Design a binder for this molecule. Structure first.
Ligand code: OLC
Ligand code: OLC
Ligand code: RET
Ligand code: OLA
Ligand code: OLA
Ligand code: OLA
Ligand code: OLA
Ligand code: OLA
Ligand code: CL
Length: 258
């Protein structure tokens, strides 16, 4: 049901798509080590936040590594072009990985925002439930990205309603709680929010490639878009989240931080 099956791929497009997926694997398992090492320099209050990045890094690296092997098993160079052989490559694997990493990415945001008790459990439920609705409706629409572009749009519209509400919650919790953050992190968190608004919006852009660029280069463009957003929403995001966690741990008196 995905457009990846409709086209033959020259050796250049195929190996380029293969090098984007495997490169992601290394970048994510490389950042994992980093997020693993610096956790000792994070006070216990925020130490959970860096651990979630470690979880996020592994969750993403396993699907990318799976996507790569699934990419090289499904196609075979025949008569000058890589042609589909078996059907085992699908973007759906991504959406099942967003269901897991998105909650972890949202959790670590609220942890550095210094929410606790009622609000943490409450804000986390509406956000996770809001995201899960976004990812699921979007997963139903991409099943029609080959057959019914109309349905892709309709489900894309619904999915965007969830996305809009989610950010309003995130943005509202941020701008109303940054005055409680230490070490000047009240300024850095605002940038992280703008880092979110940009990196997260690249996903719907790739979601619509079947609609405005239906060809083998649109598939290369999609993975390139997924790759850019994936490194920003998870790696750079986790790094930015780590720094805020460390910076505040230092201002709170934690000696390792500091
Ligand atoms: C369908 C729209 C339903 C939207 C209803 C979502 C209301 C819950 C909510 O947004 O909570 C945010 C608040 O800041 C946390 O307590
Ligand atoms: C189906 C297509 C529907 C398309 C619909 C498009 C409308 C999107 C408009 C705004 C996005 C909201 C972005 C969230 C910005 C958060 C700002 C905020 O939360 O408000 C300020 C805060 O309260 C300070 O205290
Ligand atoms: C890896 C981290 C994240 C946050 C992945 C996020 C994915 C999205 C925000 C996807 C959004 C979509 C929308 C807004 C509507 C079209 C369908 C999508 C699910 C791709
Ligand atoms: C330095 C620490 C980070 C590096 C550790 C990970 C090393 C490389 C992992 C590459 C795995 C990719 C498998 C390719 C799948 C395939 O195309 O067949
Ligand atoms: C219905 C599914 C969604 C359920 C709501 C999610 C609940 C989120 C609660 C926290 C998950 C992470 C547990 C660690 C909390 C960190 C507390 C701390 O050390 O400050
Ligand atoms: C484990 C994931 C499931 C969690 C269920 C709770 C989240 C509810 C979120 C929004 C409702 C999504 C239901 C959409 C179903 C329509 C698709 C279809 O017709 O098959
Ligand atoms: C959560 C559910 C949100 C709204 C679902 C509306 C989309 C249903 C489109 C069905 C496609 C069709 O059969 O024509
Ligand atoms: C993801 C973005 C979701 C919004 C998609 C755009 C909303 C619908 C716009 C116009 C629909 C035009 C339908 C043309 C016929 C399609 C077959
Ligand atoms: Cl991704």
């Amino acid at each position: 049901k995905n457009i990846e099956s409709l086209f033959d791929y020259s050796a250049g497009q195929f190996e380029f798509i293969d090098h984007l997926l495997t490169m992601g694997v290394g970048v994510h398992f490389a950042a994992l080590i980093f997020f693993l090492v610096v956790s000792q320099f994070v006070a216990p209050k925020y130490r959970i936040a860096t651990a979630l990045s470690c979880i996020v890094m592994v969750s993403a690296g396993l699907i990318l590594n799976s996507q790569a092997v699934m990419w090289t098993d499904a196609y075979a160079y025949v008569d000058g072009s890589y042609q589909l052989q078996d059907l085992t490559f699908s973007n759906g694997y991504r959406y099942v990985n967003w269901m897991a990493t998105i909650p972890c990415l949202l959790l670590q945001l609220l942890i550095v925002l210094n929410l606790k008790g009622k609000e943490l459990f409450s804000t986390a439920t509406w956000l996770i439930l809001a995201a899960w609705g976004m990812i699921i409706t979007g997963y139903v629409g991409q099943l029609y990205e080959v057959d019914d572009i109309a349905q892709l749009m309709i489900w894309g519209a619904v999915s965007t309603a969830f996305f809009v509400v989610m950010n309003w919650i995130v943005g509202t919790k941020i701008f109303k709680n940054r005055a409680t953050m230490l070490g000047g992190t009240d300024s850095t968190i605002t940038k992280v929010f703008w880092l979110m608004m940009f990196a997260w919006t690249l996903y719907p852009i790739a979601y619509l490639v079947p609609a405005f660029m239906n060809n083998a280069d649109g598939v290369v463009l999609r993975q390139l878009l997924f790759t850019i957003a994936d490194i920003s929403s998870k790696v750079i995001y986790g790094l930015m989240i780590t720094y805020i966690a460390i910076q505040q741990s230092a201002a709170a008196g934690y000696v390792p931080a500091q």
